[PDB]
Design a protein around this motif. Structure first.
Motif, mmCIF file in Angstrom:
data_model
loop_
_atom_site.group_PDB
_atom_site.id
_atom_site.type_symbol
_atom_site.label_atom_id
_atom_site.label_comp_id
_atom_site.label_asym_id
_atom_site.label_seq_id
_atom_site.Cartn_x
_atom_site.Cartn_y
_atom_site.Cartn_z
ATOM 1 N N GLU A 42 39.275 48.560 37.475
ATOM 2 C CA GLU A 42 39.634 47.325 38.147
ATOM 3 C C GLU A 42 39.145 46.180 37.277
ATOM 4 N N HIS A 44 38.647 41.839 37.548
ATOM 5 C CA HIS A 44 38.694 40.594 38.311
ATOM 6 C C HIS A 44 38.928 39.388 37.409
ATOM 7 N N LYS A 47 35.841 36.954 36.935
ATOM 8 C CA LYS A 47 34.821 37.516 36.043
ATOM 9 C C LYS A 47 35.236 37.442 34.568
ATOM 10 N N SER A 56 40.458 29.833 34.737
ATOM 11 C CA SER A 56 41.070 30.812 35.619
ATOM 12 C C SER A 56 42.554 30.951 35.315
ATOM 13 N N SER A 91 48.509 44.681 41.520
ATOM 14 C CA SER A 91 47.534 43.763 42.126
ATOM 15 C C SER A 91 47.474 43.941 43.639
ATOM 16 N N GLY A 95 44.154 37.829 42.496
ATOM 17 C CA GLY A 95 43.020 37.720 41.576
ATOM 18 C C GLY A 95 42.346 39.003 41.153
ATOM 19 N N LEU A 96 43.000 40.131 41.386
ATOM 20 C CA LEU A 96 42.437 41.454 41.212
ATOM 21 C C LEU A 96 43.536 42.343 40.656
ATOM 22 N N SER A 98 44.396 46.437 39.490
ATOM 23 C CA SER A 98 44.017 47.842 39.522
ATOM 24 C C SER A 98 44.860 48.608 38.511
#
Ligand SMILES: [Mg+2]
Ligand SMILES: [Mg+2]
Ligand SMILES: [Mg+2]
Ligand SMILES: [Mg+2]
Length: 211
Positions: A42, A44, A47, A56, A91, A95-96, A98
């Motif tokens: 995963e 982020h 991060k 971002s 996703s 914001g994530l 996989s």
DNA sequence: CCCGGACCTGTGACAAATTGCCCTCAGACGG
DNA sequence: GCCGTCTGAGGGCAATTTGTCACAGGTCCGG
């Protein structure tokens, strides 16, 4: 003070073609896998932006495009070839992301090479990331080393583009640039000399020290 | 001897790709 | 329960860097 990447020499010396952004992500997968495993990782957005000092917005662009450029990429251990991904990325939450790394790669990820992640994160050219990984494989505790790399083996493992088979282009667009980034962007101080045989230059001899 | 040819080097040009920036606008959340 | 703010998923840009090749300029080989 920052994540310690470690990896099998088999990966340091594998044949593949990855971008800077893809190689950056690859360090975190290896970090995630190793701290344990089926292959599911995963990443982020927030991060990643903080780790590599991005906004971002620009972080989001880098992950997405890196991820779709993995399709069709393959890895060779000298030989045997594997795909990196066996299912597309996706996703679940905003914001994530996989991802599904080929579980058969695990034993190749974990006779080893190690570097702190801060050492490489300001390098821009992916070939210069490759060269710095290959040098770390030979580093001594105290921080110095010496190694002779064969020119064809550089061309085969780092998959240099076809015109760097002409040595004057190899010098100008690969060797000098990457020795300079390392000297300007890492804590390493690197020098080299050319080994010749007849008219052909065959190896490059690297010596380095730590600041 | 000097030739044309097969090697090697470095550099000037241009094409293709990548860099950090900039702007828009809807999602997720909390107070 | 609505809205203001913090995110990030989109769309772009010009300036640099990277990838390609013609041509200048060196050597030695064989005829
Ligand atoms: Mg980018
Ligand atoms: Mg003449
Ligand atoms: Mg002149
Ligand atoms: Mg000539």
């Amino acid at each position: 003070n920052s994540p310690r990447i470690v990896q099998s020499n088999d990966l340091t010396e594998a044949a593949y073609s990855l971008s800077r952004d893809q190689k950056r992500m690859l360090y975190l997968f290896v970090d995630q896998i190793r701290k344990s495993h089926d292959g599911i990782c995963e990443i982020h957005v927030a991060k990643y932006a903080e780790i590599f000092g991005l906004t971002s917005a620009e972080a989001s662009k880098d992950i997405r495009q890196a991820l779709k450029s993995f399709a069709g990429k393959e890895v060779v251990f000298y030989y045997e070839s594997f795909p990196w991904f066996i299912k597309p990325a996706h996703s679940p939450s905003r914001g994530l992301y996989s991802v599904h790394i080929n579980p058969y790669l695990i034993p190749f990820f974990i006779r080893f090479t190690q570097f702190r992640l801060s050492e490489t994160k300001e390098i821009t050219n992916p070939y210069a990331m490759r060269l710095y990984e290959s040098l770390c494989q030979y580093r001594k505790p105290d921080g110095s080393g010496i190694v002779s790399l064969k020119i064809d083996w550089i061309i085969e493992r780092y998959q240099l583009p076809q015109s760097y088979q002409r040595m004057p282009d190899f010098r100008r667009r690969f060797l000098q640039v990457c020795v300079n980034e390392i000297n300007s962007r890492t804590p390493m101080r690197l020098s080299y000399i050319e080994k010749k045989k007849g008219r052909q230059t065959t190896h490059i001899v690297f010596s380095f020290r730590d600041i």
